[PDB]
């Protein structure tokens, strides 16, 4: 919510208290999501100040406080920063901002990445150019500097974060994307390349000095109507673990795809039905593997922009002799949703 | 604070800037609530959202920052979310919401949970129903769907929470009260029961399969005057430890009973008197023993809705030789209070 | 940002979100700052509520959110609590308050506390005196109760923190500050003696029972241009490190000179040049040793009150046989910050 506007800087403060419930079948150990509380509550501010008639200053910053812990020792358990950025928009010429923010190649994960509660499979936290990420430096275009209405690239500097674990580090790249849309169409292409650290190249899963992220999206959004459809490959960059093994590291390739339909009626109710499927291939030991592989059904309930309800549903088609022990139970989502 | 009020949406940002410290004697090891430097600070938001004229969404967060650990390693020492749900309420039907919220029991024992800074003894945190918990389902009725004014009830689901400790962990459960208010008049009973996970059973201290807890409230408030009386009981649910043996788990049975008198004068000076014990019952290797005992002398001075200081002393009764090894020293509390 | 005025009550939300990259080479272990991503998110308030027409009572707090952890295992690492505090100010006679808040010594510190991005090199925090402590009570006068006009004083009583690190804690203390200000010129002393604890005294560097801190300051602060120098010392009170053996424990005695040399354009530029050396003498098994030794030069460009950039650079003269291991590498900074 907007909470201040005056002398040309805005602030909105906004939240939300998510109350959530997984429901499964186990131990939950076999499902796709995990089963009881998962009640989270979300606060950031967005700025943005008018420093004069062509250029903008802006800053945004998001945290995630889980609400399934206790008060005690586990307190902090999944509380994090996702965004943290300030930056310059001037004109025509584009945008420049720095921080944590997300990956170049979610402008194409981002098509599909609209289920209730699941979804968005692909787009990895801190997995170079696919989700959020820290230390980027992006700029973006718009219209082709107002030249070609429509028409938007961008380019990512992804510096190098080495951090204790193989999963969250990442070494220097550059990502790209470009997009085009047109009356309710539209279509993105996105690419990153980034070297791997030492502690990623020690892991026993996956071989590689570099790894590559790319991803097709295509649109259809407009009349009520949302229908989206991504085609992503990636070379040592999605993070897997044999859970028989405990071995741990990258997938050499992966193979992704992801279909959402859905329709929003007028009086709030918006259906949802998705696909998604991610196999990773040449995989030391194991060869071809689904890493995930869904259909999901769902829906939103809008009782107004503050307020909803949601149930999900995943029918999970992983097999139970899945190789690399990746769950086969389904699970349902319902949540109660109150943001401003 | 109420900061945003349009289009039907009302937040209210709220928190406050607690300066707080304890004076006992010791190490403060043998006291009751230990020494030295307590300050903390709240921040937290309230939602609500008028759907229509019958219906309204409403969302609530709170965190609690301590002010008493250094910016090394011990920062978020204490640090946590409090309270994280949303819900609906729906013209005399009744509301529901689901989260992290107050256990049902705390209905009752909210009675006398108002000393300036201790007391509300009894209502642990991540204990089934007795203070905040993760996890529960409540449905709450006001004046028996609009037909016996001052009339309410409500029941709670909890789900199991299966944590890594034996003290913070709950298994499925079902919890209700009812109360009634009449011109300053008010009188609850609350009751809860649960199942115990396999880790509260490895427990050396207590044996049963199943938690309950109950308790009764009755109040005048009123008049500027404010007087309130719980008694309750638990089997198998409040947490205990045995300080000599190092030994831990929960009180077979306790017997509780709370008494608090305060008046409120109108230049801004609350006095308060309270007397609290709480006695376990059938512990393993020990029999009787007093896990709570004391009386409580206090005052709050409220300069305005804003601002305000008190001083809350414990004369504890606890004796010396007490077989838990519970402290037996006083404590006195000072504090200074800004809030909006 | 004012987010809120009514009834006597004024509340100020304020934050910022920087993203900044520090530059050195190396791996940045012998460079003054380090190098990669640093950027990090504030968030506070700010209330003072007016009781009537002499008194006002007040809360701060602040947190420190950082933007450069992964969402993982090292999320919350360096996050903190920088103020908590709530206090009472009352018309001529002064104001007192309690919680986490500068020591005294910063008093006199903080003239040449202005780099871009560094210096403020003695203002440690969690170091008795010289910066943001918990559990001190300060009492601070304004104008020698209303009779001598820029004439200023503090005294501040520091209760023990008992912490789990020698580096963290301190024992009881007491400090003071005195300082004159006229017509763009300002003079301040400062000073405070603390017990130290047993862990500080059982460290292998240094030795005494008292810490002792203080520092005189002289500033020009008028027609856009800032100049101003501080002179320390300290004993028993600065902690170091010996990286060879690592060993660790606090410098007997420190000397300390800081200066600092700032112009403001009216078009929004803010060069800066600084110089700050911090020699600690009576090291067991050292002698004499630089702890601190730059050159700074550095601009901020302030678009408006919200928004700026900057780079700051340290032409670091620490040499490369530092006896302590003090790295000698130049760092250089670079900043994009909203803020609000």
Redesign the interface.
């Known amino acids: ?4 506007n ?4 805005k ?1 909105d ?1 906004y ?5 959530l ?1 997984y429901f499964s079948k186990g131990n939950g150990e076999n499902s796709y999501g995990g089963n ?2 998962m ?3 979300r ?1 950031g ?1 967005k ?1 943005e ?1 008018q ?1 004069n008639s062509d ?1 903008t ?5 998001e ?1 995630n ?12 358990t999944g ?4 965004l ?5 928009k001037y004109a025509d010429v584009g945008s420049f ?4 923010n997300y990956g170049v190649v979610f402008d194409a994960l981002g098509y599909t990445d609209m289920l209730p509660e699941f979804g968005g499979d692909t787009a990895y ?2 997995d170079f150019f696919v989700g ?1 990420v ?2 980027v430096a992006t700029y973006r275009n718009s219209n082709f500097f107002g030249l070609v209405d429509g028409l938007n690239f961008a380019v990512q500097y992804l ?7 193989a ?2 580090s990442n070494g220097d790249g550059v990502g790209g994307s470009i997009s085009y849309e047109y009356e309710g169409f539209g279509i993105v292409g996105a690419y990153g390349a980034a070297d791997r650290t030492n502690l990623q190249e020690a892991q026993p899963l996956g071989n590689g000095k570099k790894a590559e992220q790319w991803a097709t999206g295509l649109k259809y959004d407009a009349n009520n109507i949302y229908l989206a459809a991504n085609y992503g490959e990636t070379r040592n960059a999605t993070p897997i673990t044999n859970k028989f093994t405990n071995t741990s590291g990258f997938a050499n390739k992966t193979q992704d795809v992801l279909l959402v339909a859905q329709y929003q009626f007028d009086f709030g109710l918006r259906p949802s039905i998705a696909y998604t499927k991610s196999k990773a291939k040449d995989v030391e030991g194991i060869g071809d593997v689904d890493l995930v592989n869904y259909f999901e059904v769902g829906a939103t309930y809008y ?5 909803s ?1 949601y149930v999900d549903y995943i029918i999970n088609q992983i097999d139970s002799d899945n190789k690399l022990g990746v769950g086969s139970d389904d699970t349902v989502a319902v949540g ?5």
């Open positions: 919510a907007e909470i201040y005056k002398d040309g800087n602030v403060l939240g939300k208290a998510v109350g419930h009881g509380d009640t989270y509550a606060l501010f700025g100040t420093i250029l200053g802006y800053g945004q910053w945290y406080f889980q609400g399934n812990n206790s008060e005690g020792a586990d307190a902090q509380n994090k920063t996702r943290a950025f300030a930056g310059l901002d720095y921080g944590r936290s801190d959020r820290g230390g510096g190098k974060n080495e951090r204790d674990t999963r969250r009782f107004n922009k503050n307020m309800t109660i949703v109150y943001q401003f």
